[PDB]
Amino acid sequence: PKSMQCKVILLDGSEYTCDVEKRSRGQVLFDKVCEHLNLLEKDYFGLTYRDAENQKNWLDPAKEIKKQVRSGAWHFSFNVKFYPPDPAQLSEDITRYYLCLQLRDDIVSGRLPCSFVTLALLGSYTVQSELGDYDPDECGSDYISEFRFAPNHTKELEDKVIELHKSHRGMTPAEAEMHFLENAKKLSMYGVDLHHAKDSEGVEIMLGVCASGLLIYRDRLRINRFAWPKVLKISYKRNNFYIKIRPGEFEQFESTIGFKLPNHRAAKRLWKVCVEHHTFFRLL
Ligand SMILES: Clc1snnc1CN1CCOCC1
């Protein structure tokens, strides 16, 4: 029975290696990674791989691994797929822990923009969770700890993390993680999966996919929002993505809205993430 070596980047940056039978469905490898992680609330999470165009794709747990990674290496990352709108409602602390690790990477990467003060407050919760109570013996007038807190570090930011870390004395790891989550969940780009597209006029937009629905970022003044209940049908054809908006009260007909994606694969990828968010956040 021929088995393939899988390599999985974990949220703490370490690399987990295992083997699955070469005809294995994605779920088999996902089960192995979740059991390694002692994670029971698996529904929020998934594995990503890079396609032949070097684009991040969700590994479909229901499909053969080989028919998705195709000609590519069996290298994956473990990631948050569905960001819970209210992480306080998750049943386990370890679930909230993995969600915190993902968000820290969202922040450092710049995918989750964040004000100076929120960067410092999130960092201060991370430090409290991992070091415990502020100790000055690990803090002088020039201290720059190993934690990555931001896409661009400054001494001012490092200073503010420590000022706030002093205020958290006696905070337990589960407690600091929950505070981290109560601030992060409020950020305007929390859990937003962004896709480059063009509107029906050719103007470059971003389509955001999140729990509350589909977001259309035209400019800073022009931001359309479509709540999931208002979307009856999501489709793609060629490089085009369409959503069928529900008829408003007393309106005779549905309206269709169309976008141009970079290529056919980008159109299919956005279609599949929309259906999955629509399904997930309809049931949650
Ligand atoms: Cl959604 C959302 S909010 N910030 N990032 C994302 C996209 N993730 C980030 C890494 O894992 C797979 C893709």
From Swiss-Prot:
One of its GO terms (cellular component) is cytosol. One of its GO terms (molecular function) is actin binding. Expressed at high levels in brain, with lower levels in kidney, intestine, and testis. Detected in lung. Keywords: Acetylation, Actin-binding, Apoptosis, Cell junction, Cell membrane, Cytoplasm, Cytoskeleton, Membrane, Phosphoprotein, Tumor suppressor. Residues 4-284 form the FERM domain. It comes from the Eukaryota. It is found in: Cytoplasm, Cytoskeleton; Cell junction; Cell membrane; Cytoplasm. This is Band 4.1-like protein 3. The lineage of its organism: Eukaryota, Metazoa, Chordata, Craniata, Vertebrata.
